Amino acid sequence: WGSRKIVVVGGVAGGASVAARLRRLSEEDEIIMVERGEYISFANCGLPYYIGGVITERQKLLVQTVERMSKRFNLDIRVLSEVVKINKEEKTITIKNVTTNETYNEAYDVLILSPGAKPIVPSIPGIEEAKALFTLRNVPDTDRIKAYIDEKKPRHATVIGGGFIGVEMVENLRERGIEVTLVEMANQVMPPIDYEMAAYVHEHMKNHDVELVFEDGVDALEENGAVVRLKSGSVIQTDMLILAIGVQPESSLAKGAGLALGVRGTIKVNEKFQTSDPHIYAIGDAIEVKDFVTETETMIPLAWPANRQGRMLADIIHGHTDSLYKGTLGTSVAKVFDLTVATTGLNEKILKRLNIPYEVVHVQANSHAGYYPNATPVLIKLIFNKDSGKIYGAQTLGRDGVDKRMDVIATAIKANLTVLDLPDLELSYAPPYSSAKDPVNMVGYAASNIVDGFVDTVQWHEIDRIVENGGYLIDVREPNELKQGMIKGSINIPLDELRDRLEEVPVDKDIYITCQLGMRGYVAARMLMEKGYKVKNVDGGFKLYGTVLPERIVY
Amino acid sequence: GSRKIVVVGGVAGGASVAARLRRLSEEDEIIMVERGEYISFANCGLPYYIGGVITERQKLLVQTVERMSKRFNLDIRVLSEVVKINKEEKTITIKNVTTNETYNEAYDVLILSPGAKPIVPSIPGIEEAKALFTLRNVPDTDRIKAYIDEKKPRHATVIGGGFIGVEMVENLRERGIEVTLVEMANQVMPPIDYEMAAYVHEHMKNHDVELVFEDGVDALEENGAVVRLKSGSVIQTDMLILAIGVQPESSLAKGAGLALGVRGTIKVNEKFQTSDPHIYAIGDAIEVKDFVTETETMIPLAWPANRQGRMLADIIHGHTDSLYKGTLGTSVAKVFDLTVATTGLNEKILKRLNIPYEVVHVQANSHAGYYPNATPVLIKLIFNKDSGKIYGAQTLGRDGVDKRMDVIATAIKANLTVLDLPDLELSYAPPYSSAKDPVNMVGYAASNIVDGFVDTVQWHEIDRIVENGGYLIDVREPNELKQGMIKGSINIPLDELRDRLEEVPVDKDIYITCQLGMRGYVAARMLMEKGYKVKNVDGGFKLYGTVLPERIVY
Numbered sequence A: 001w002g003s004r005k006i007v008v009v010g011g012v013a014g015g016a017s018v019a020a021r022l023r024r025l026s027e028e029d030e031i032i033m034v035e036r037g038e039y040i041s042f043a044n045c046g047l048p049y050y051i052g053g054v055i056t057e058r059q060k061l062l063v064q065t066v067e068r069m070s071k072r073f074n075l076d077i078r079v080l081s082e083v084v085k086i087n088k089e090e091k092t093i094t095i096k097n098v099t100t101n102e103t104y105n106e107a108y109d110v111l112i113l114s115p116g117a118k119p120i121v122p123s124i125p126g127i128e129e130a131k132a133l134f135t136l137r138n139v140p141d142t143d144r145i146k147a148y149i150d151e152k153k154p155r156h157a158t159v160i161g162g163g164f165i166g167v168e169m170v171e172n173l174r175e176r177g178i179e180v181t182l183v184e185m186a187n188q189v190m191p192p193i194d195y196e197m198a199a200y201v202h203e204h205m206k207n208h209d210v211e212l213v214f215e216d217g218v219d220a221l222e223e224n225g226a227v228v229r230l231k232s233g234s235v236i237q238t239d240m241l242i243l244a245i246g247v248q249p250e251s252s253l254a255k256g257a258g259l260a261l262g263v264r265g266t267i268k269v270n271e272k273f274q275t276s277d278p279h280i281y282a283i284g285d286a287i288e289v290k291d292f293v294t295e296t297e298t299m300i301p302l303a304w305p306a307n308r309q310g311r312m313l314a315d316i317i318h319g320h321t322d323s324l325y326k327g328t329l330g331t332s333v334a335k336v337f338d339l340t341v342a343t344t345g346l347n348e349k350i351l352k353r354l355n356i357p358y359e360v361v362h363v364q365a366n367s368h369a370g371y372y373p374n375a376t377p378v379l380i381k382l383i384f385n386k387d388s389g390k391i392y393g394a395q396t397l398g399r400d401g402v403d404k405r406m407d408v409i410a411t412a413i414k415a416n417l418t419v420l421d422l423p424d425l426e427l428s429y430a431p432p433y434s435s436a437k438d439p440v441n442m443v444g445y446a447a448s449n450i451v452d453g454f455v456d457t458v459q460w461h462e463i464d465r466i467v468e469n470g471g472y473l474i475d476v477r478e479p480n481e482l483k484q485g486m487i488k489g490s491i492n493i494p495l496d497e498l499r500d501r502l503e504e505v506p507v508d509k510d511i512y513i514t515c516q517l518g519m520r521g522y523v524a525a526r527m528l529m530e531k532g533y534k535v536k537n538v539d540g541g542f543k544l545y546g547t548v549l550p551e552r553i554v555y
Numbered sequence B: 001g002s003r004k005i006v007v008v009g010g011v012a013g014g015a016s017v018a019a020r021l022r023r024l025s026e027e028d029e030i031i032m033v034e035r036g037e038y039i040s041f042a043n044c045g046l047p048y049y050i051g052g053v054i055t056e057r058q059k060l061l062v063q064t065v066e067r068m069s070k071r072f073n074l075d076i077r078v079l080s081e082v083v084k085i086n087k088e089e090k091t092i093t094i095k096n097v098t099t100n101e102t103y104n105e106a107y108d109v110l111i112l113s114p115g116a117k118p119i120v121p122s123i124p125g126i127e128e129a130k131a132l133f134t135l136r137n138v139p140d141t142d143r144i145k146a147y148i149d150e151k152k153p154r155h156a157t158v159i160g161g162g163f164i165g166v167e168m169v170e171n172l173r174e175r176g177i178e179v180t181l182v183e184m185a186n187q188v189m190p191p192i193d194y195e196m197a198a199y200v201h202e203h204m205k206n207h208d209v210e211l212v213f214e215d216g217v218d219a220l221e222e223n224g225a226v227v228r229l230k231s232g233s234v235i236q237t238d239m240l241i242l243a244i245g246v247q248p249e250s251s252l253a254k255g256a257g258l259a260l261g262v263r264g265t266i267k268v269n270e271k272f273q274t275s276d277p278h279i280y281a282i283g284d285a286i287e288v289k290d291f292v293t294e295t296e297t298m299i300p301l302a303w304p305a306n307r308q309g310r311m312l313a314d315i316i317h318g319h320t321d322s323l324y325k326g327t328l329g330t331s332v333a334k335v336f337d338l339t340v341a342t343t344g345l346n347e348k349i350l351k352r353l354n355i356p357y358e359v360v361h362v363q364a365n366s367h368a369g370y371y372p373n374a375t376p377v378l379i380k381l382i383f384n385k386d387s388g389k390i391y392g393a394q395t396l397g398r399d400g401v402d403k404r405m406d407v408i409a410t411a412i413k414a415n416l417t418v419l420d421l422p423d424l425e426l427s428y429a430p431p432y433s434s435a436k437d438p439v440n441m442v443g444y445a446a447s448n449i450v451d452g453f454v455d456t457v458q459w460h461e462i463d464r465i466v467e468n469g470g471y472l473i474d475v476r477e478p479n480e481l482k483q484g485m486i487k488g489s490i491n492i493p494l495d496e497l498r499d500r501l502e503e504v505p506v507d508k509d510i511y512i513t514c515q516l517g518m519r520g521y522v523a524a525r526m527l528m529e530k531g532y533k534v535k536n537v538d539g540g541f542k543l544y545g546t547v548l549p550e551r552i553v554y
């Protein structure tokens, strides 16, 4: 290999990952990493936790220091240096030293853009004058929010936007003893998950005394941000505001160089991360990726992809192209007080948008064997193709064992496994860790029963209309469980008696079954089908139904 | 259409096949025959009940006879021992355990899931050993707990240091009983390798277990209270637990002239069929092929027994037969504050089969270190250097160990190679992982070997190498030298190395060590690009010093 001058724009997840591997591939290359801020490789993900006082040491947020990293990898690292323009036909960039105000041009043979994505700042009347309004991207943002809390002693905070990071901000503010209201324009927190899964999250947040405001938005900020006027007309009195309404790719250098853009103003790249200019590559939050499941062009600003992309790009630049980026799966996770919430692939909302036929299943199963202490429920939703078993996505929540189940399913998906394969994953079983069939196996079995046609099912959002239309709903729980409530129109025949009471099941009506979790409902469905009844199980049973439609519960 | 299916054994395999069979057919007559008082008991929880961790005896019974027979319309017969298969008449003979009276029962299809029984060695004095116990079922468990209550033993001896022996060690220790573990091998836990066991041994010693290796019991004296060891050492003890393995319960099959396999297992085809077309067999009792090399073996674990049962029910009354592709051998045990997990094959087995492999040891944190309470996860990955085929993996640490093993075991069964592991997009936020998960990290390290970016040596090679002309550079920061170094090491910290290149001999083979191995790899990359012949010491000083603590130099 012939040595070259490689310039990297941005010094965090994408930029630092590519620079480090680039050095490992060549001692001779000149590697320059240009970063507008003071810090390289900061823990962007750690910022909410430093604000919450969970991370107590500011310096812990520095994953690599400029000194250590430039020495270890012989990198010419230039912090407080802003790339102001790309000159692509000249093959130079224009850099401004922020401290000294000197500007200069820097020649490159290869240019790498990893400038990330900036917070979306809405044009809300009063926002300019809102003294205690904050966005969160970098370390200085973090210092500012923390200084304000430490010095001004806010008693109430408002969080605008209920995405994964909005939610983490909600938690960390509460942790500091600040009362919190969360404002969301959607009808749920956390866009990546579906409505009925969000319903559990909402419960857990409200149990920690978070006020949740849905289908509302900030119409105006009044009294210097101390007064929040909602679109609806309602008002929130507050001592500070955190804006977390999402991010937009930092593609201005690209636009300025006349480089091709992708969806939502991302920098467009080919399979090798190359932009429309042969000498300029781009990675990280700023680029368009294909989603792994459908290969649809999208933007998914996550750290694993940024790091994977930077690491792969280094190999690619050196001609090691046997492996190219397979797209982003969208595996993500958040701590929500006592809960873990995870997602991978696509939700129902995206799939409907894309006109893709799917089925879903909701299976609750214990984090580990129930005879062993401190087992806790893990709820897995699995979304899949009825004919092929192709997995479109999964969502999981629970107090423990959630990251594990998501990681297994995420692995299965990238390995091109179908729901029919999930029951055959030989996982680690001893009493503290799992059960003889892991929750992953279990969700695999439930989905396989649909694929194989052993059971037909209906959703929480279908059952009421079905009962109105003459559906005959049999609740197979024990009579005592009905005190928790029931679905309207239900008739109770406990599972264990059903075989002795088949004469009570009409042979002239379409039969619908619910239990508590769906498992006993499924057993009943199997029995009745075999007896030649047409029957469907209510997926997730009453437990799920009552969580998402509590106002419809009959007592 | 209809069939009379008779199932022998009412626990993991038997109850699994029986429950799925019913869900498939309401028409079949299904009989489940069990010699003990209980079905579906938690075999796995028994040590934890003995340890007072599972406080409630009743929790050990997963389903009752009456509830299960009702729910799935099953003819469940406890305290009934099948004594004979009559394959020509398609009948079995059943003996009432309480009365000793027998009767015959006809079958269309017979399913054997009889499990495995404890290996009981021929120890002089074992017949008089009042307080010697094996552990299989609930009566065994009640007897052990009763002995502990009535005699209040001060000290217990555990013979056999497999996953189960070790569980019993913990559970007895946590009761305040002193414990000596006696092991024929030079390590606890046969499924893991020696250098991995070294971490386990340290942890057990820190919890006051006496560990006795490469020793056995020559005699039991004073009614089991005096343990005569082969080394000459004598243990005074108040009870003994025998946990030296299990052997398949294949006497029914053997007695009916069915083909047998390795270790006396019931031999079966890919659909669990024995040499008789109307008798099937599953669970600990059967021979399986290991998933990785397809070698005939016996792997007595619950996930397999449960899976085989569900799959067999599908073979009989389900749709398109899925065939059993063998047992991977994924297992895990709690060892005090440690989790220890394994999957696939270890070095010892690979060496026995003469299969060429490489290994990597990567210690990475359970989650990002900038977030509180991150703890090390050590992953050993064993693989083929040419194809990148994964042969096996082992992992240990305090937290996040079961997760990493499950991802790797998923990857193996999905036929991924080490080259694919860096591309597994897993769940990352500060409490849960890092931007590159420990699994990605071990993939990268292994991929660098497969692709020739680094060459490496092992903990068990470096001393010999140094004795025979190798030049060893320790690239740790001087501060990290607190726990010592490998003999013959010369310290040039990584961050100084590039400036001090003149100090590196160009005509010698260079060996590099760090603490965990990462910075040693970085140094090796640098030196390779500068034209030196160099290898990294896999696992660095931390691994070396753990397994060879007596060789550490200060």
Ligand SMILES: Cc1cc2nc3c(=O)[nH]c(=O)nc-3n(C[C@H](O)[C@H](O)[C@H](O)COP(=O)(O)OP(=O)(O)OC[C@H]3O[C@@H](n4cnc5c(N)ncnc54)[C@H](O)[C@@H]3O)c2cc1C
Pocket: A009, A010, A011, A012, A013, A014, A015, A034, A035, A036, A037, A044, A045, A046, A047, A048, A081, A082, A083, A084, A114, A115, A116, A117, A136, A137, A138, A165, A250, A253, A283, A284, A285, A286, A301, A302, A303, A304, A306, B428, B429, B430
């Ligand atoms: C509060 C917060 C929490 C998060 N938590 C998680 C999480 O838990 N899990 C997860 O997967 N992801 C998380 N993310 C997202 C994650 O940080 C990003 O996906 C990742 O950092 C993307 O890397 P990148 O290199 O594309 O951009 P960045 O990491 O943002 O790096 C881009 C850098 O380029 C610099 N730059 C931009 N333009 C110029 C220029 N013209 N000249 C010089 N320098 C420039 C910027 O200053 C910036 O430092 C979180 C993000 C935030 C803000």
Ligand SMILES: Cc1cc2nc3c(=O)[nH]c(=O)nc-3n(C[C@H](O)[C@H](O)[C@H](O)COP(=O)(O)OP(=O)(O)OC[C@H]3O[C@@H](n4cnc5c(N)ncnc54)[C@H](O)[C@@H]3O)c2cc1C
Pocket: A429, A430, A431, B008, B009, B010, B011, B012, B013, B014, B033, B034, B035, B036, B043, B044, B045, B046, B047, B080, B081, B082, B083, B113, B114, B115, B116, B135, B136, B137, B164, B249, B252, B282, B283, B284, B285, B300, B301, B302, B303, B305
């Ligand atoms: C203490 C202990 C802890 C364990 N922990 C774990 C663990 O953590 N993880 C794991 O994966 N595995 C563990 N195992 C192993 C696990 O229990 C077995 O792999 C699993 O139970 C095998 O299922 P099986 O149906 O083949 O046998 P079993 O579950 O043993 O069922 C066989 C049953 O058949 C009955 N039977 C045998 N012969 C006859 C006959 N002639 N007539 C009538 N009945 C008969 C027996 O009484 C027995 O009840 C553990 C085992 C023990 C003993």
Ligand SMILES: CC(C)(COP(=O)(O)OP(=O)(O)OC[C@H]1O[C@@H](n2cnc3c(N)ncnc32)[C@H](O)[C@@H]1OP(=O)(O)O)[C@@H](O)C(=O)NCCC(=O)NCCS
Pocket: A362, A363, A364, A436, A437, A442, A445, A446, A449, A517, A518, A519, A522, A540, B010, B011, B012, B015, B016, B019, B020, B023, B039, B040, B041, B042, B043, B044, B045, B062, B063, B302, B306, B310
């Ligand atoms: C429990 C035991 C009797 C098996 O019985 P089982 O009825 O298959 O019980 P499981 O919970 O395993 O099966 C759950 C069934 O409900 C289904 N199910 C579970 N949750 C569901 C849900 N929410 N919605 C729809 N279906 C669901 C599964 O798909 C599965 O059905 P399938 O096999 O027909 O697909 C047996 O495994 C046993 O004895 N276990 C403990 C003993 C043991 O394993 N010992 C070894 C030492 S630990």
Ligand SMILES: CC(C)(COP(=O)(O)OP(=O)(O)OC[C@H]1O[C@@H](n2cnc3c(N)ncnc32)[C@H](O)[C@@H]1OP(=O)(O)O)[C@@H](O)C(=O)NCCC(=O)NCCS
Pocket: A011, A012, A013, A016, A017, A020, A021, A024, A040, A041, A042, A043, A044, A045, A046, A063, A064, A303, A307, A311, B361, B362, B363, B435, B436, B441, B444, B445, B446, B448, B516, B517, B518, B521, B539
């Ligand atoms: C740290 C950072 C600079 C990456 O630098 P890096 O030098 O690649 O460091 P990593 O720890 O990722 O190193 C991985 C390398 O070490 C190797 N390695 C790790 N442990 C090893 C071991 N025990 N033995 C041998 N090799 C080992 C891997 O094989 C891999 O090598 P390769 O990439 O050459 O194949 C970058 O990830 C970063 O800046 N992160 C923080 C920013 C961020 O991610 N932000 C998003 C918000 S959280």
